[PDB]
Amino acid sequence: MTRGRVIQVMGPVVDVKFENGHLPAIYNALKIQHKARNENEVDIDLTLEVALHLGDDTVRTIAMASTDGLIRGMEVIDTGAPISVPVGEVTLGRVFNVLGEPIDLEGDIPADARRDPIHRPAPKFEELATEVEILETGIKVVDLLAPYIKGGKIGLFGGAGVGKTVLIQELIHNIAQEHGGISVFAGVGERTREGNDLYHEMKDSGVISKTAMVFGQMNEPPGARMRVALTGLTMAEYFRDEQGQDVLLFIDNIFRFTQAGSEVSALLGRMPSAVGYQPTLATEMGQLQERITSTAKGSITSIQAIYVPADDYTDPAPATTFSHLDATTNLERKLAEMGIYPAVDPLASTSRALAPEIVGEEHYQVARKVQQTLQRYKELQDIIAILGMDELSDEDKLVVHRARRIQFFLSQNFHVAEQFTGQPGSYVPVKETVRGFKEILEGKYDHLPEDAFRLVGRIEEVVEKAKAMGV
Amino acid sequence: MTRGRVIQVMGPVVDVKFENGHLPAIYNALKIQHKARNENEVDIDLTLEVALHLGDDTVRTIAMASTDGLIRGMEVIDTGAPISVPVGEVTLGRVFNVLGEPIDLEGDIPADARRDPIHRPAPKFEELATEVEILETGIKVVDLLAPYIKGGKIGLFGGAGVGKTVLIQELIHNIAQEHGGISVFAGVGERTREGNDLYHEMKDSGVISKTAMVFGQMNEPPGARMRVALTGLTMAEYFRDEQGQDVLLFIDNIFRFTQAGSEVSALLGRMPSAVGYQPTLATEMGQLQERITSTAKGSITSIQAIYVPADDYTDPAPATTFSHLDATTNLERKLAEMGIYPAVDPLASTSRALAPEIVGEEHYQVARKVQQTLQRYKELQDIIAILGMDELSDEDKLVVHRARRIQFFLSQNFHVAEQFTGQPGSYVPVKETVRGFKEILEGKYDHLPEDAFRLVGRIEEVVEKAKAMGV
Amino acid sequence: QVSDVGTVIQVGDGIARAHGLDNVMSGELVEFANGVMGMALNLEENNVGIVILGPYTGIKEGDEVRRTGRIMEVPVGEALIGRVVNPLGQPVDGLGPVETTETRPIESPAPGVMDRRSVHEPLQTGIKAIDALVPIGRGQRELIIGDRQTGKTSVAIDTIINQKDQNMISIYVAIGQKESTVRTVVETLRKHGALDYTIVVTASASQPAPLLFLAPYAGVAMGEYFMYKGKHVLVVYDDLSKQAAAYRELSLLLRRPPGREAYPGDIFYLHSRLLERAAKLSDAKGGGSLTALPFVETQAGDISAYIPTNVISITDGQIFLQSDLFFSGVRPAINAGLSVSRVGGAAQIKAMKKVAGTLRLDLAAYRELEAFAQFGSDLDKATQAKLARGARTVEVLKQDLHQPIPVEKQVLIIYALTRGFLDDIPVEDVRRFEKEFYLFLDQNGQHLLEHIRTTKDLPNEDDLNKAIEAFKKTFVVS
């Protein structure tokens, strides 16, 4: 067998020279395992991924860990295949890094286990399934104004501190508890404090037994941050390919994935794109998202969180992410400051599943009425402040009277909000929430104080709160 | 052997090849002297400063004058030391160029005089000594909103044609005439006309008997424009150290130093940094700035004018020099155009000495109140332009009324500006400035017209001007 | 004796290229014939790119270059307390040498995802706005970002001074400052008594670029030694922007491919690797913690720039300072509308949470109605009522320089403001009202302070209301 040698070290970028005619393929993984020959050296256990073929039997590679300690001339072992990760029933309840090595300190995966390569072509045209089914989540705003589609891609856009991580945790809890399906979490560019909190929350709540978690942390090189999403996708694809399940893939942040890609491109020396991003941004995003599709055997649905820098939706990462989403959700610090969690904007959120023939005529009419009332209320807030609502017409007074209650009733208490407030969460079926909103629109509860509608689940709980306060 | 040979000539950069094993050290001064051998050549008398070692026995240098007439193959002499300039009592009352050769036609320095190398390390943390004392200048804006510090470091920012040179001249006229120490002036990249006028002015005033002057102007090559400031600083450091004497150091335009560095950086083989500057912008400027300090054995107070290219305060050269200063005043073209000189921005200017225990409680409160009123007037500028002055509230109108009068009273008539106008100018003590601004703030003089406050000294001159106007 | 050697090819700008040195490691230290150290960063086919950790004027082409076989390490220990040192660990204030017995690698692994515990205890800064609206806990990473001359240094100095009675060790790291500023800061700390538990690490502007590049890592390496013994440490990085500028200078001089704004591709990796080392250790690992306050300086308020965005995406929360608020009299200039803190609530005591719950909502309403406030008093009565409440809130949150406040007094004054007890005091008298209220609480009502201090909860509601009314019976309006 023939081995390589280290030619250059320039940070996280390493060049390896092989024997002529034995070059590894692009995306093949290489292994460096070295023990110190003397006191002036250190042990090295490092892996590299092939990026380019430079010519003269030389290969340009990106490292998946720290390259400190490398010496020009160390032996490099060719694995003969892309990065492979353990897969199947063994992965449930474990925490993994980018390479598929456990980090939960619970023991190693047996070496005889099946492993799959990360890089593979997307499913073909002939084998896709295009049926549309509504996915129930139990959250009022989501189930009413922006229904989710089984097998589709859903994005959550927002700035810092708006509640994306909490909302993803609540979605995981609700869907896993009420549907019993398998879920996979991919922590792309995960903060270590947040990852530890998430792991402890899952362990405490018991959801961990049905979930496999992959973590690529901020203190890791850009290649490691880049490939974690694909590792999670590879772990998720098995359950629908070999077992025909319905799986949920939660991706922590696409923005950090694009940032890692841009860092890798700049390290490789390519010419920067529009605002410094990589030229291959669209192709990378496509090769990530296009594998999340429904087929005959099974379906994967993805809930993705997006970070918008300085509220700039024109930014290339959100801009090229938008093209792949079936439903989008916009979170507002404006709503968060007022106390309305989950702080979903009821007018900026859109979904292709909000159609009369998909959700039903009553559902569609109720949602459209709610949106119209909120839109009309948006034009009276300014006038009311300068001259009170008694200046306006009689109908607009009722419009405001009902829009305040609609705004407050769009908020809900979450199970994961226990650690913040102490009030237990609730799961609201779509058939219940549509009836509640229809009743509020038609005025059956116009007499109750508006504070009774804040942080409440089903409609009867509003009446209960009004009774408690002494209406 | 110290004999070298010229290899390349590319503008102000020359490459010299030496015998192996005898390369000159970095910053060494090399002499090129050549007499014409035939009618197709010209005489050369040029000094070069070593910059880089390129390997292969080749050194890349920077020329201190024009390289016209250089021929590949001239002999170069290594002097074995950096540039050395005459220093001490012989330098008082003289005018020098970058190389330390007098240009005032008063004779040549004796060949036995002490000379000091240009390049040296900066003083140390334990050597530095700190204390805050207000330096009275007689200018209302400086004395009130951004006091100068005796022994501190003062920078005068401003675009093209705003008034920083006139402010330098006013400060010289107000302080240098009685300072009691040594004065040093270093003109970098400024007008030869200004140098000549200042020299004759100092001869007339008699300050020249205790001042040393170094001139490298905009007609000089970048080699000389990069080193004239260091020559002047080296002259000042002797008076600081070997005699323990207070030094006034004036630098005419310190930005031209970094401009020349950027001009020459491209020819040295360095990759360009942001907006075309050299990668070493911060370190090169720091190595110069940190030498201009006051130590235990002697004090240096320095006033620098810092040109701002194209009125861009975010340009890297102005942005980097901000952290090196104790007190700054930012001149503004907007204020210069309305006719209120010295056109100092009353909010952008800051000083480290504006503290209650340094200037006094009353002074601090008056300054803060003035700044607050000016900020409120600045904020009202959109509503005033759109909705008109009539619809502002009772308090906003009073704020505008006080603010315009304050902004006008901040202007002053200068002694050196009597060349542009017949008004003789004035010197205003800090007590007078504080009392006058306090009286304006208390609403005492709201019955006077706005134009009475322009270009006057003490508050009584406002009453005099109003009575001339007829009040 | 034996030592693998090399030959210098190029010297200049603080960068040296060496031929040879076959077996040098990436990041290894290397010493020249002059007796100055250097760090090897570029390992190429036929040359080694060396960054010089000292004055390069004495190095000439052809000089000998020798391996050391050691990764960079920094001295650590108790003796560093009260000293001023450089990133190499050498004292710069005089006062004799430093007796340290241990060393730590300057680059070391961060604590694992399983080594940590969730942040649950507060870091008291003494700034009312920070403690009420943007809480900071022990183990958190908080970014302080703003334009020049907005109080960024003042916030850090006030925090370090306020840690006097808490069991915390503070480390102040200065990058790119002129040594006069550093000496003044040290004098201020000595005057206020903070040098008894503070380590100062300084990298002046005239020092070579690699020292500025390495200084924050030296600081965090000094901090981790105390962290792993069970102590609590606070680290302040004065300018990550200047660190990044120095690193960009080095990368450009080594001719690595440039990204946006000529920065290298690993500029985010550098800062993430630095900041992720701050952590809250679990009770199995000792229970110690290290909390960090990185600084970023922006230009013309642009927070979309490369380094600001990179640092924002890493930290748990950010604090925004604005000259608009600074000159309008609102100093400290925290923009509570934009500032965020994900570790809020857990980083506050129960009384502080109880009182800040209403304060957040009141400020949110005031920020909305400030847009309509420009039309004078021609407003619906509730609107100017809320404006009057917001103005008093803003006056209360105001605070002068170097005046830390106890948390019990903070919660009491916030309770007084938010329950409506201040609704009859004129806006011009709020500062004096608070100042007199603190003296009144010192003279009488020490039981409320003791109750809050011991049980971390609000006192009996009746007693507090009676005390506030008794004080208002003695306050005199202007």
Ligand SMILES: Nc1ncnc2c1ncn2[C@@H]1O[C@H](COP(=O)(O)OP(=O)(O)OP(=O)(O)O)[C@@H](O)[C@H]1O
């Ligand atoms: N205090 C002042 N009183 C009256 N006129 C002034 C004053 N300051 C500046 N001016 C006017 O503005 C001009 C600016 O002159 P000055 O040489 O000081 O400018 P500058 O900022 O140094 O510009 P440059 O970069 O072109 O040298 C003066 O010639 C004069 O016409």
Ligand SMILES: Nc1ncnc2c1ncn2[C@@H]1O[C@H](COP(=O)(O)OP(=O)(O)OP(=O)(O)O)[C@@H](O)[C@H]1O
């Ligand atoms: N709360 C405050 N009350 C009064 N003065 C204050 C306050 N905070 C800061 N200052 C003053 O504001 C000035 C600038 O503060 P500081 O130097 O801390 O700002 P900075 O943003 O760190 O500046 P730099 O950009 O120069 O590093 C100082 O004179 C300081 O005393």
Ligand SMILES: Nc1ncnc2c1ncn2[C@@H]1O[C@H](COP(=O)(O)OP(=O)(O)O)[C@@H](O)[C@H]1O
């Ligand atoms: N439903 C909720 N109830 C109360 N607080 C919440 C809720 N959702 C989020 N928060 C608060 O918001 C903070 C940050 O939310 P996070 O999940 O980090 O959003 P993002 O990840 O988008 O910044 C948390 O510290 C939490 O206290």
Ligand SMILES: [Mg+2]
């Ligand atoms: Mg998040």
Ligand SMILES: [Mg+2]
């Ligand atoms: Mg001028």
Ligand SMILES: [Mg+2]
């Ligand atoms: Mg500062």
